Point group: C2
DNA sequence: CAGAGGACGGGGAGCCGGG
DNA sequence: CAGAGGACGGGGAGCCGGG
């Protein structure tokens, strides 16, 4: 999904990228932290990030609704400065409504 | 304000099995070392009709759970291996017609 | 190191989790 | 075990990434 060959598409478009160069982050606490290049046997730290691409979300009933596309976040462990902590990684592009 | 597709988020700390980024089933180890830590994962997914707020007249629609990839310490034979596994991460709306 | 309401959700840092 | 195209997206295991 979306099942393209069947004509499907997201309400909000996203872009996904692998992030190998991360140096600072906001942690789960809401505080800014330094993220290490490598963690221990030894690995580079990589994060899969997915952001809103781009108004309004596609396919919305504008007679009843305001809408916008926004980036939501998950929490992924990372070695940070040394502590093993949850950090905010962008993860989807979802559609939020009102009025 | 609310989502077009309602999600539920939860902490999971009892994951023994998962699908890895290759598409293959793998065993997830209880704990990982540095001082030891349990592996917990943040998982978000759809709860449940179309999505909410959609122009029904013109569009079919459904809510679906999307996934991200998170490293975890996994069993590979008699060795430990640090592999990306698939984790539910959001609920989004897919359109058609 | 010390939870949860209203119906036609709730345990572990101002943390994660609204016709 | 060695990339990318139509236009009013592209590098590192069937892997990640459509009026």
């Amino acid at each position: 999904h979306p099942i393209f060959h069947r004509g499907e598409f997201s309400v909000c478009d996203s872009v996904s990228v692998w992030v190998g160069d991360k140096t600072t982050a906001t942690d789960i606490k809401g505080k800014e932290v330094m993220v290490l290049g490598e963690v221990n046997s030894v690995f580079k730290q990589y994060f899969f990030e997915t952001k809103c691409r781009d108004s309004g979300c596609r396919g919305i009933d504008s007679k009843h609704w305001n809408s916008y596309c926004t980036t939501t976040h998950t929490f992924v462990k990372a070695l940070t400065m040394a502590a093993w902590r949850f950090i905010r990684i962008d993860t989807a592009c979802v559609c939020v409504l009102s009025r």
